[PDB]
Coordinates of C-alpha atoms and ligand atoms in Angstrom, one line a residue:
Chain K
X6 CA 64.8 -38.4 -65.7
X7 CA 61.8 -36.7 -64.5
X8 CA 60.2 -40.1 -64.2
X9 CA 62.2 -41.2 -61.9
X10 CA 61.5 -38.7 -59.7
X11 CA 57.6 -38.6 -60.2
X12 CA 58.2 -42.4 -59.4
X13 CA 59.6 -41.4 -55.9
X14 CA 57.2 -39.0 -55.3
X15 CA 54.0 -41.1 -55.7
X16 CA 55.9 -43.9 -53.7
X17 CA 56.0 -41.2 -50.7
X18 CA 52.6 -39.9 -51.3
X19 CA 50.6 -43.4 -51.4
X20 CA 53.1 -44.2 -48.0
X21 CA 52.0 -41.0 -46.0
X22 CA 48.9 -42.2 -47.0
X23 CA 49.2 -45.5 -45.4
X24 CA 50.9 -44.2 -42.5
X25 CA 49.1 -41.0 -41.4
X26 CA 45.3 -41.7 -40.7
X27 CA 45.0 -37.7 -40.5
X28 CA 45.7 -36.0 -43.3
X29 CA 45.8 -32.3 -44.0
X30 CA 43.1 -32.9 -47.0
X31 CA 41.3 -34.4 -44.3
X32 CA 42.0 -31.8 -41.8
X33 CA 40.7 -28.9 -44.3
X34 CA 37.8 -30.7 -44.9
X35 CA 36.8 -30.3 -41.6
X36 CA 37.8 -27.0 -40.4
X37 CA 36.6 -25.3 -43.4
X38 CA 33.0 -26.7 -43.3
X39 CA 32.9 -29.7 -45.8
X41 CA 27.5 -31.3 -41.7
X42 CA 29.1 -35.3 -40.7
X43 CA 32.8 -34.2 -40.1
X44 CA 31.9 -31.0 -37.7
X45 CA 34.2 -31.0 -34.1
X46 CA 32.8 -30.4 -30.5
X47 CA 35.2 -26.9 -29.7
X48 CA 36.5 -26.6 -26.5
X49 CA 37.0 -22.9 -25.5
X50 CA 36.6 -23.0 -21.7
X51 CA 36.9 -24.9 -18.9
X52 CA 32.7 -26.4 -19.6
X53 CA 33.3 -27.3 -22.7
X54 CA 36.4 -29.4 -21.9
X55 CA 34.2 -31.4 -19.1
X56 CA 31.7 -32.0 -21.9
X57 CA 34.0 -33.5 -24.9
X58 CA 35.2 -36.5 -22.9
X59 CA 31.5 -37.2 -22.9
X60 CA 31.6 -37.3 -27.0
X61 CA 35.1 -36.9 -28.0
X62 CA 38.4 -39.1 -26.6
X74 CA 44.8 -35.3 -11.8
X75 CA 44.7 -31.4 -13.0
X76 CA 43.2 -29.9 -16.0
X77 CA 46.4 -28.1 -17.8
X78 CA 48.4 -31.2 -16.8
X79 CA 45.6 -33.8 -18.2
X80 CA 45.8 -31.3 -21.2
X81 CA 49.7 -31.6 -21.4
X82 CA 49.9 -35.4 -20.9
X83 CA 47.3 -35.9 -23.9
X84 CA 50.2 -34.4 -25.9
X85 CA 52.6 -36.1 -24.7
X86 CA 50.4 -39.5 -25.6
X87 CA 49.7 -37.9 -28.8
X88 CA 53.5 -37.3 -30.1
X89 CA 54.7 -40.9 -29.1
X90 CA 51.7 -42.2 -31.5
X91 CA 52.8 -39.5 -34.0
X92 CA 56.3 -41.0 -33.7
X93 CA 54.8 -44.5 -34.0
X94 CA 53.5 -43.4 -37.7
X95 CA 56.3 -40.8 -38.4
X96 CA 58.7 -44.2 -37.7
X97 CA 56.3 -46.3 -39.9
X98 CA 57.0 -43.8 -42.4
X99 CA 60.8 -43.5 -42.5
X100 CA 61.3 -47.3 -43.3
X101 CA 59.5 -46.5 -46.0
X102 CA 62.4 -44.4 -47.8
X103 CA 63.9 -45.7 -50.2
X104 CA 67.5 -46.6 -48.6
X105 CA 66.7 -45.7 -45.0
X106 CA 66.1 -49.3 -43.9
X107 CA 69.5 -50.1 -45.5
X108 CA 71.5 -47.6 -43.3
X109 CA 73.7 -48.5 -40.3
X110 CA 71.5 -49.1 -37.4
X111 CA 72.8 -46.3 -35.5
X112 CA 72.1 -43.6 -37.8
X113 CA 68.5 -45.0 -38.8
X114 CA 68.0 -44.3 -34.6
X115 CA 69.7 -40.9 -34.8
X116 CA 67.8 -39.5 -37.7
X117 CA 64.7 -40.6 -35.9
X118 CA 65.7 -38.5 -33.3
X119 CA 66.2 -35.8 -34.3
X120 CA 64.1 -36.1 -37.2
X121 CA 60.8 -36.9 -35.2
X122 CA 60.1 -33.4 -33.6
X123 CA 60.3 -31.2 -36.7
X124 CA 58.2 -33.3 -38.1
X125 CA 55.4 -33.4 -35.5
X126 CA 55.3 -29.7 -35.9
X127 CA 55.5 -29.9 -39.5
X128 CA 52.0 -32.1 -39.7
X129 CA 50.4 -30.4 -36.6
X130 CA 50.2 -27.4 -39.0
X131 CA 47.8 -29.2 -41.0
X132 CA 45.6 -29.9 -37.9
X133 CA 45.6 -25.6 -36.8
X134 CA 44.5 -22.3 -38.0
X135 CA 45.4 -19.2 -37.0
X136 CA 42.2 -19.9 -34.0
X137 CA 42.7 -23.5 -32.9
X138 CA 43.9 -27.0 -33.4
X139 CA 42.4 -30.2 -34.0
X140 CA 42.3 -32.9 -31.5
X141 CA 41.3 -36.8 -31.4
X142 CA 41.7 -37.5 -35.0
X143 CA 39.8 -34.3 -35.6
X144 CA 36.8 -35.4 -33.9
X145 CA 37.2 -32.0 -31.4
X146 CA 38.7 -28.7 -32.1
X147 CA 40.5 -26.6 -28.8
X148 CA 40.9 -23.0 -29.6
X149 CA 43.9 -21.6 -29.3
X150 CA 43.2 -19.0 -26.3
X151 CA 41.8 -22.0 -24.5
X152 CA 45.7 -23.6 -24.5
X153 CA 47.0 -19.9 -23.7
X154 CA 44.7 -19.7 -20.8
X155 CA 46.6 -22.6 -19.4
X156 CA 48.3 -21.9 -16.2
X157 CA 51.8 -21.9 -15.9
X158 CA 54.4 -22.8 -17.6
X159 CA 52.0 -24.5 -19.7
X160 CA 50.0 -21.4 -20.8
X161 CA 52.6 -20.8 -23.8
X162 CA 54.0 -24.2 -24.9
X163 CA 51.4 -24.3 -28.0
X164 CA 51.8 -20.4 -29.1
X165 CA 55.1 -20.7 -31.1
X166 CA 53.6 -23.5 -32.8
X167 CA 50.3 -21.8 -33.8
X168 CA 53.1 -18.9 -35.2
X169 CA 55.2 -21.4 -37.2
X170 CA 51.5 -23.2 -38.3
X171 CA 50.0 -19.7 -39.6
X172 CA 53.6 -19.0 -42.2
X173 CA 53.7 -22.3 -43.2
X174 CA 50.0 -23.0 -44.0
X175 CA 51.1 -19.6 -46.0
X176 CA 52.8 -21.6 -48.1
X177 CA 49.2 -23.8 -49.6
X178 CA 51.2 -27.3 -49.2
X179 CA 49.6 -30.3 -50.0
X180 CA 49.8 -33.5 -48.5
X181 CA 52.0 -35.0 -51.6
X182 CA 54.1 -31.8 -51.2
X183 CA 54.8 -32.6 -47.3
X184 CA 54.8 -36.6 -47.9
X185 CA 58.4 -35.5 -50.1
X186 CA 59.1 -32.8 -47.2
X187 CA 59.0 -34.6 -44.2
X188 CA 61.4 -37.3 -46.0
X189 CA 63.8 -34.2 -46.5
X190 CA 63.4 -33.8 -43.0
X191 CA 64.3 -37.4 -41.6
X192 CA 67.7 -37.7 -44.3
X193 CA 69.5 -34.7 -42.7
X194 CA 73.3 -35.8 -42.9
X195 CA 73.7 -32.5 -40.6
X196 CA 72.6 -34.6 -37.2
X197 CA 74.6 -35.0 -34.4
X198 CA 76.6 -38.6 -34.0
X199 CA 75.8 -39.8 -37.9
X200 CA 78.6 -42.3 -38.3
X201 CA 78.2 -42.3 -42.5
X202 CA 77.0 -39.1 -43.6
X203 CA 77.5 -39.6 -47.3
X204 CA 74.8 -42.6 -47.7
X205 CA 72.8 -40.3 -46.1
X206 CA 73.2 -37.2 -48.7
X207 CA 72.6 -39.5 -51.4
X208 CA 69.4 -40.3 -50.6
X209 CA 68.8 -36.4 -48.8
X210 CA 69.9 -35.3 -52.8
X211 CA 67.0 -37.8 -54.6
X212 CA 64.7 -36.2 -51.9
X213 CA 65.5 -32.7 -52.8
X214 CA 65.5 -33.4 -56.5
X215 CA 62.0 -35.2 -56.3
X216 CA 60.5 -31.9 -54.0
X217 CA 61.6 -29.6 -56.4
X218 CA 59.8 -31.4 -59.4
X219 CA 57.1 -31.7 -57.7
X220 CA 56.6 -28.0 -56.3
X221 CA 57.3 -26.8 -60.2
X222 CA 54.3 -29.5 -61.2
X223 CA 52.1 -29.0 -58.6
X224 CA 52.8 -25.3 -57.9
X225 CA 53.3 -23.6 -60.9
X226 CA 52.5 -19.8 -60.2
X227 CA 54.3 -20.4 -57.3
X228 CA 57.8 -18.6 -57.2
X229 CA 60.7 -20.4 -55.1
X230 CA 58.5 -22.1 -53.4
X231 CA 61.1 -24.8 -53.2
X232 CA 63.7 -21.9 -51.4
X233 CA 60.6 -20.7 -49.3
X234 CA 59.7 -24.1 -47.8
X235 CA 63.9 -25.2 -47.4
X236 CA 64.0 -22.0 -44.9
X237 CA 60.9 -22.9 -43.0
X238 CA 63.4 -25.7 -41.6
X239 CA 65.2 -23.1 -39.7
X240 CA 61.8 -22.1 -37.9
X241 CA 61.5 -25.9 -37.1
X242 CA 64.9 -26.4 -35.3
X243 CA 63.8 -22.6 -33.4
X244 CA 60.6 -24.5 -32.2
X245 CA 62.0 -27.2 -30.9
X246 CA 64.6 -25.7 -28.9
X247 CA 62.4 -23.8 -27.3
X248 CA 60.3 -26.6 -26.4
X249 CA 62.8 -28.3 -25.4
X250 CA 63.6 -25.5 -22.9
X251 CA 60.2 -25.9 -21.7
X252 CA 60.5 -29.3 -20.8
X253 CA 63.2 -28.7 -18.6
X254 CA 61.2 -26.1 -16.7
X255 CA 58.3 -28.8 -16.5
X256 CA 59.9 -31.8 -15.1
X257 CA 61.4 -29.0 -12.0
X258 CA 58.4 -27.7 -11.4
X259 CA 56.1 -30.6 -11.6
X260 CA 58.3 -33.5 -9.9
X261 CA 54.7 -35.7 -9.9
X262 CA 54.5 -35.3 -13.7
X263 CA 55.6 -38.2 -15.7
X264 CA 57.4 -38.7 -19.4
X265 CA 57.0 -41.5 -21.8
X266 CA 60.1 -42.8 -21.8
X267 CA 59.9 -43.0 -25.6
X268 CA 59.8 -38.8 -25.6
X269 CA 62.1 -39.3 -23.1
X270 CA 64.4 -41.0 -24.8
X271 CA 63.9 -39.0 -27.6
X272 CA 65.5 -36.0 -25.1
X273 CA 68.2 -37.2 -24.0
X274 CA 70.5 -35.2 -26.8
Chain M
X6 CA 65.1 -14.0 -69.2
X7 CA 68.2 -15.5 -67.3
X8 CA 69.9 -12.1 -68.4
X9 CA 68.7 -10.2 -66.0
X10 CA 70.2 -12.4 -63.5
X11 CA 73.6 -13.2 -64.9
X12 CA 73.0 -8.8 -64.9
X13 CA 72.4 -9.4 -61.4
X14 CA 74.8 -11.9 -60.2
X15 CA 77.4 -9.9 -61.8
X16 CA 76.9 -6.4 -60.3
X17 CA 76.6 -7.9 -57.0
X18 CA 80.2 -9.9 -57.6
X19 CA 81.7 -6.5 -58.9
X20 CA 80.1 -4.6 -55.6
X21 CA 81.3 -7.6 -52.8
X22 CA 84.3 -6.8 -54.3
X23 CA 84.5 -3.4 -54.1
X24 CA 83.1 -3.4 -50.6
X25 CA 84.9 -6.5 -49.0
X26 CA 89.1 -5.9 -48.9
X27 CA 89.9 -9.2 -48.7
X28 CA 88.1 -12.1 -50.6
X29 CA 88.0 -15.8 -50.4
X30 CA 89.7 -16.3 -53.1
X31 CA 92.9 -14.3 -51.3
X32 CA 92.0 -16.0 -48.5
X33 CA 92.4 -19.4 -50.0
X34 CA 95.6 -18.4 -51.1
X35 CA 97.0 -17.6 -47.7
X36 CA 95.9 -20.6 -46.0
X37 CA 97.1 -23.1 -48.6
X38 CA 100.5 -21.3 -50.5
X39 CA 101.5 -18.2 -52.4
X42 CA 103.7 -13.9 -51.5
X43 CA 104.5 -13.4 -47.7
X44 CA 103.1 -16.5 -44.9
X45 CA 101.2 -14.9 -42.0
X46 CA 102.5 -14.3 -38.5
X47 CA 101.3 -17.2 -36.7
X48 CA 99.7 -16.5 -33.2
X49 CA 99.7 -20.3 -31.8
X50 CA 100.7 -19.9 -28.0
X51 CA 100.9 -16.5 -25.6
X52 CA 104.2 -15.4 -26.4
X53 CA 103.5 -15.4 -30.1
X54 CA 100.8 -13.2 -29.6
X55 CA 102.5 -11.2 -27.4
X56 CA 104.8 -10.6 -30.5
X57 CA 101.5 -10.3 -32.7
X58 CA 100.8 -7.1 -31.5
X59 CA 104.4 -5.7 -32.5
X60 CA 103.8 -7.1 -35.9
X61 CA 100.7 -6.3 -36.5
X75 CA 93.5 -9.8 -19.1
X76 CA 94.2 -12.4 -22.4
X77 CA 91.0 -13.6 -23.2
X78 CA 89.9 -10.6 -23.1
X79 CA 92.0 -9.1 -25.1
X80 CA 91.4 -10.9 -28.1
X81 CA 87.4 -10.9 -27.5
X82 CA 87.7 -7.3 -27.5
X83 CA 89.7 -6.9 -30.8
X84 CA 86.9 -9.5 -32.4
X85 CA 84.3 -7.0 -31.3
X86 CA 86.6 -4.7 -33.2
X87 CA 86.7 -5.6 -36.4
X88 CA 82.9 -7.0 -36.2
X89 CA 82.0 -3.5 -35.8
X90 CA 84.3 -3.0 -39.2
X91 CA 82.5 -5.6 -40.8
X92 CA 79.3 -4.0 -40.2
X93 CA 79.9 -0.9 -42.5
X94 CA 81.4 -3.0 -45.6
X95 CA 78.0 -4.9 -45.1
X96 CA 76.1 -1.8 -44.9
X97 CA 78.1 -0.6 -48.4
X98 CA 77.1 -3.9 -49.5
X99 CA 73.8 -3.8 -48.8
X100 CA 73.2 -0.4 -50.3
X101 CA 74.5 -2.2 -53.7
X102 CA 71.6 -4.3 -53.6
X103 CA 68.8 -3.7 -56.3
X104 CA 66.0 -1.6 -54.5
X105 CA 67.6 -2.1 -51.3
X106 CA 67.6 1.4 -50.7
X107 CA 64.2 2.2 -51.9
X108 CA 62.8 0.3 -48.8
X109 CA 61.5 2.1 -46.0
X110 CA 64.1 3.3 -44.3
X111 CA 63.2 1.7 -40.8
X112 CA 63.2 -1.5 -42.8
X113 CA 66.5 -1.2 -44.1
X114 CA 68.3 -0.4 -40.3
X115 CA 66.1 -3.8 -39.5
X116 CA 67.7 -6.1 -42.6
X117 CA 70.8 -4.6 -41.1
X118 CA 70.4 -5.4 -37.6
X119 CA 69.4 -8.8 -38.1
X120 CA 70.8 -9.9 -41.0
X121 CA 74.9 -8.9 -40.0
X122 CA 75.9 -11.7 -37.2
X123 CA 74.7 -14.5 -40.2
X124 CA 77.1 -12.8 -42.8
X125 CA 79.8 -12.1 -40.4
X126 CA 79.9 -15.8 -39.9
X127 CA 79.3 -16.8 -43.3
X128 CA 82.3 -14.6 -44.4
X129 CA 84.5 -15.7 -41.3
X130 CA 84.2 -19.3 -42.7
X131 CA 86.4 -17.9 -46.1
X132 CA 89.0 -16.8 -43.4
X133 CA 88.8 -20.3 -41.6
X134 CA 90.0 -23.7 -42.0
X135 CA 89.6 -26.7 -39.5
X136 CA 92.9 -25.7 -37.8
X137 CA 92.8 -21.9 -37.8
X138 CA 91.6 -18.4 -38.8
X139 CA 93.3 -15.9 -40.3
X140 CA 93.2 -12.1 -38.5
X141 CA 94.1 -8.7 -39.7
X142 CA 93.5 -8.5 -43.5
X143 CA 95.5 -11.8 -43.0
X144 CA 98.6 -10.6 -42.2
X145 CA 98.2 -13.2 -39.2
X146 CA 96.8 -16.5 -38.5
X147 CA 95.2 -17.6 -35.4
X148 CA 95.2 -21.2 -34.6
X149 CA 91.8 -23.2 -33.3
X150 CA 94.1 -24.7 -30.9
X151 CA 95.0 -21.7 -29.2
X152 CA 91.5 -20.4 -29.3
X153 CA 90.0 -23.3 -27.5
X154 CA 92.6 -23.2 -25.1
X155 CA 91.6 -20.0 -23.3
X156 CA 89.6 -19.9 -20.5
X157 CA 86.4 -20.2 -19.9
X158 CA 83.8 -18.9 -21.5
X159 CA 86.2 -17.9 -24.0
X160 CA 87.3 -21.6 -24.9
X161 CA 84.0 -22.8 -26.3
X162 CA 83.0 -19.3 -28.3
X163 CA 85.2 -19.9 -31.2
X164 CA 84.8 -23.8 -31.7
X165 CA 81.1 -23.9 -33.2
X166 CA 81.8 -21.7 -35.6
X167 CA 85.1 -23.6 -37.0
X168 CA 82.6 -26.9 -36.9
X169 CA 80.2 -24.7 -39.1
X170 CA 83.1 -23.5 -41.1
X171 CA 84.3 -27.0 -41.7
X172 CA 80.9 -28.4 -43.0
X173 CA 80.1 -24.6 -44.8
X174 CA 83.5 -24.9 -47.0
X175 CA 82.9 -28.2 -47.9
X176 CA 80.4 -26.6 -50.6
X177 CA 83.4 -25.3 -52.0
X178 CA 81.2 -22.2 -52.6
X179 CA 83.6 -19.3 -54.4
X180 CA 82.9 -15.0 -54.1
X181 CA 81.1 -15.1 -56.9
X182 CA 78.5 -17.5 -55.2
X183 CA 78.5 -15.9 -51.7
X184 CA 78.0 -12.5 -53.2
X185 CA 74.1 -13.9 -54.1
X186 CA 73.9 -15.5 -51.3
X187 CA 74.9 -12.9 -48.6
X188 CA 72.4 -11.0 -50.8
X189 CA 69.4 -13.3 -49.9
X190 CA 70.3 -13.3 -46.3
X191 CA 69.9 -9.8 -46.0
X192 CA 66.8 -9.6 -47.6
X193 CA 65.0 -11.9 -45.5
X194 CA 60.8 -11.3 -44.9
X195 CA 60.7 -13.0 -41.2
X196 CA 63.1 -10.3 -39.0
X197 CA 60.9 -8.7 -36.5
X198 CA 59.3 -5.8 -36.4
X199 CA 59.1 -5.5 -40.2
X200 CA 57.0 -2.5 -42.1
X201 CA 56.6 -3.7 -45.8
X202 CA 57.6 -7.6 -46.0
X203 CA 56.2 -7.3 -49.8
X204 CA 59.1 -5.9 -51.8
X205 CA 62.0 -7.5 -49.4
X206 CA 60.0 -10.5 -50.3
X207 CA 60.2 -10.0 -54.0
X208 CA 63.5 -8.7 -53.9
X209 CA 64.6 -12.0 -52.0
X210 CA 63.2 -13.9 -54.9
X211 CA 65.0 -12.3 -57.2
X212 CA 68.1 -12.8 -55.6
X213 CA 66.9 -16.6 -55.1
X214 CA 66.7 -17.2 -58.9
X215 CA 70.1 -15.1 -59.3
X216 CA 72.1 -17.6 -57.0
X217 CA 70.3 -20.6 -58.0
X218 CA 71.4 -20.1 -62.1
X219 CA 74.9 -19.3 -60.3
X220 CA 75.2 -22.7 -58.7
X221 CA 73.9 -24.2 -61.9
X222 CA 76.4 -22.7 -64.6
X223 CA 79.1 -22.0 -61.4
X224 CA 78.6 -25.7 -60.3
X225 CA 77.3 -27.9 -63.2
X226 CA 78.5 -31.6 -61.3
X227 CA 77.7 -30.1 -57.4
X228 CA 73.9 -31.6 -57.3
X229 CA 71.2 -29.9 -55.4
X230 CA 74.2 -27.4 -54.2
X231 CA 71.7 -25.1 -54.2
X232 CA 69.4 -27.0 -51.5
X233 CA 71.9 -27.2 -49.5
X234 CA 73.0 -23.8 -49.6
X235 CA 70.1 -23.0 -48.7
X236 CA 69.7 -25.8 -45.6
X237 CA 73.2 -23.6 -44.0
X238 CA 70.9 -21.3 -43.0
X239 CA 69.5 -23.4 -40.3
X240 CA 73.1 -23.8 -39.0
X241 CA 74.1 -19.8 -39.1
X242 CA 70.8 -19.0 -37.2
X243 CA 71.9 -22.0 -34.5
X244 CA 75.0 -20.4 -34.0
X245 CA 74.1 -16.3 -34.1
X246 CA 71.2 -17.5 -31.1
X247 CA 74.2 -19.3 -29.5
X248 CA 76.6 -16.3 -30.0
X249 CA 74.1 -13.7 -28.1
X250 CA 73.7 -16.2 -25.2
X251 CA 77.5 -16.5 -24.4
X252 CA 77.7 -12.3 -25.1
X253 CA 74.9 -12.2 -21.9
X254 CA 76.8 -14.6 -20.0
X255 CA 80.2 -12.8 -20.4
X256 CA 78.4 -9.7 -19.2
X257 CA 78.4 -11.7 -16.3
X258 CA 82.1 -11.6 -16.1
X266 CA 83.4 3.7 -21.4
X267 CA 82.9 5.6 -24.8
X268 CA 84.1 2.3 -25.7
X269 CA 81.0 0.7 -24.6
X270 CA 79.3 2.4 -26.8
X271 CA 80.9 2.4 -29.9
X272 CA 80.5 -1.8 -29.4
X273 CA 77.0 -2.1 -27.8
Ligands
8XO301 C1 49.0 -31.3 -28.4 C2 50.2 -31.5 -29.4 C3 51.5 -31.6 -28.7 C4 52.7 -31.3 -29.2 C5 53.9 -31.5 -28.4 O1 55.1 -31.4 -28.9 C6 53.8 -31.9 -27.0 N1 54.8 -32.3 -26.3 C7 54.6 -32.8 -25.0 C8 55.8 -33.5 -24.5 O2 56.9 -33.4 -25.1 O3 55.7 -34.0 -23.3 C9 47.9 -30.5 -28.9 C10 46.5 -31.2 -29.0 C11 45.8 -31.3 -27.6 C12 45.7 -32.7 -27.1 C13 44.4 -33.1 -26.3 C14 44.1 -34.6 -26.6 C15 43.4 -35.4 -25.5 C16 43.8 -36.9 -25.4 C17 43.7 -37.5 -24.0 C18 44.3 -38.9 -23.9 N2 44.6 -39.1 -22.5 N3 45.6 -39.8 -22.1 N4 46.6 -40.3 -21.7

């Protein structure tokens, strides 16, 4: 049935909703120009000493450890979210903790999306906006750990998702029977197959005119995996170069591969 | 309707074949039974015998440079098969090409593989993973991630007739660099993406969502072609010839 499926999918809507207090209807609301919900923009080194004063060591570094802070609460909700899933509660332990992380990542990048444009990205729950050749400015390495994720943002907001599409997505995402160390894999699929089968309803409902959409948005999960690598690449460079700098042990559990 | 990509589906079946010696269906038949078992190459003196038949490690990276470089014109026959492949812009076609021929030489190696082996020369031999994995370093670890996407690839139990679409839609894909005219690959691509889905449907009536996962393999292939090019510029850490392989 259909209905089953539409079942599923409002379920995973109405628990993104719950679970992410930034949505991307939200997000658009705001950067496209819907007088209350206007950000403070920091493009320069002024502006950045004048939204603490409004909005929420070194100046790249305080930069990259606001990050940081920001993906373990995205992990927080992103968690919040997977129990959620019908089934994922009632897999082994162990794999609940491996699809988490692995899962967690490519779908930061996945909702950050939502928060960018091809000029910037939103910042403390869209109260401030940093353009993008602010973050390039940065010196290095950090200059260049945002540009591949404004590149991935400006294909996939190509794509017109809407936050029921991605509430299905992301839940695609977090059952991958593909990660490293799953003990039962098939439990797994089971649930990864509903998924699929409840996404590709709901891109034919929701996006009629839209041809293979469902095809389109399955291969954006290769430019996810390429994103992360190369962050994680980044890291590595990081934690040599700045021996003072400090990881959330969360992330940095999260790392350890 | 659907016509026009059964239409599809088969002309691209009827050119893989034409264009591809041996298929995975003669494969199959190889590695499981029925009429002439291949020479098995499973330790250094039978390979040393291989070579009558049909400075080690070397030897057999060079001769899988070889026939890559083979591969790479039946794909470019292929390719030219392709409905308005060949009315692209030419620089657009040598780019397809360029990118898109390390993911179908590793989707097709996976017909030639299973977990303890690979066959080798029209399959007149058989390698086994053992023996691989054995040589010496880097040369151990270079064959092994592609058996362990081989393994979880065949397990989709996907026959020529499938893998004809779907080497298709990989080589018509939007996002290679340095593209002139992503428009018409585009549409292209999602004409092939209907003809492979309706495959997998009528091919695969009980195999739910094969086509999702399909689909989700081309994460893995794009994993292992980045991994591929970073051992190549390690073991150039290690005349016309050089060349030809480039
Ligand atoms: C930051 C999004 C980060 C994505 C990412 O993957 C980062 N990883 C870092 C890591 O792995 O360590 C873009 C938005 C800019 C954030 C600015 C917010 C200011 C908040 C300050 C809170 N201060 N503290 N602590």
């Amino acid at each position: 049935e259909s209905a089953d499926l539409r079942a599923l999918a409002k379920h995973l809507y109405d628990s993104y909703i719950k679970s992410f207090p930034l949505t991307k209807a939200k997000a658009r609301a705001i950067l496209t120009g819907k007088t209350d919900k206007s950000p403070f923009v920091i493009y320069d080194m002024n502006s950045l000493m004048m939204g603490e004063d409004k909005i929420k060591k070194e100046v790249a570094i305080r930069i990259f450890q606001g990050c940081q802070f920001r993906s373990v609460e995205a992990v927080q909700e992103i968690t919040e979210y997977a129990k959620s899933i019908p089934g994922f509660v009632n897999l082994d332990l162990n794999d609940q903790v491996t699809l988490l992380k692995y899962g967690v990542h490519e779908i930061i990048y996945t909702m950050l999306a939502s928060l960018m444009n091809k000029d910037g990205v939103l910042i403390s729950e869209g109260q401030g906006f940093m353009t993008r050749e602010f973050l390039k400015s940065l010196r290095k390495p950090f200059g260049d750990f945002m540009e591949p994720k404004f590149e991935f943002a400006v294909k996939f907001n190509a794509l017109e998702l809407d936050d029921s599409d991605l509430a299905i997505f992301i839940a695609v995402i977090i059952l991958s029977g593909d990660r490293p160390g799953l003990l039962n894999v098939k439990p797994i699929e089971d649930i990864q197959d509903n998924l699929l089968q409840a996404l590709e309803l709901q891109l034919k409902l929701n996006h009629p005119e839209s041809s293979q959409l469902f095809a389109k948005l399955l291969q954006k999960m290769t430019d996810l995996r390429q994103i992360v690598t190369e962050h994680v690449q980044l890291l590595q460079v990081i934690k040599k170069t700045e021996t003072d700098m400090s990881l959330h042990p969360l992330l940095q559990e999260i790392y350890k591969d």
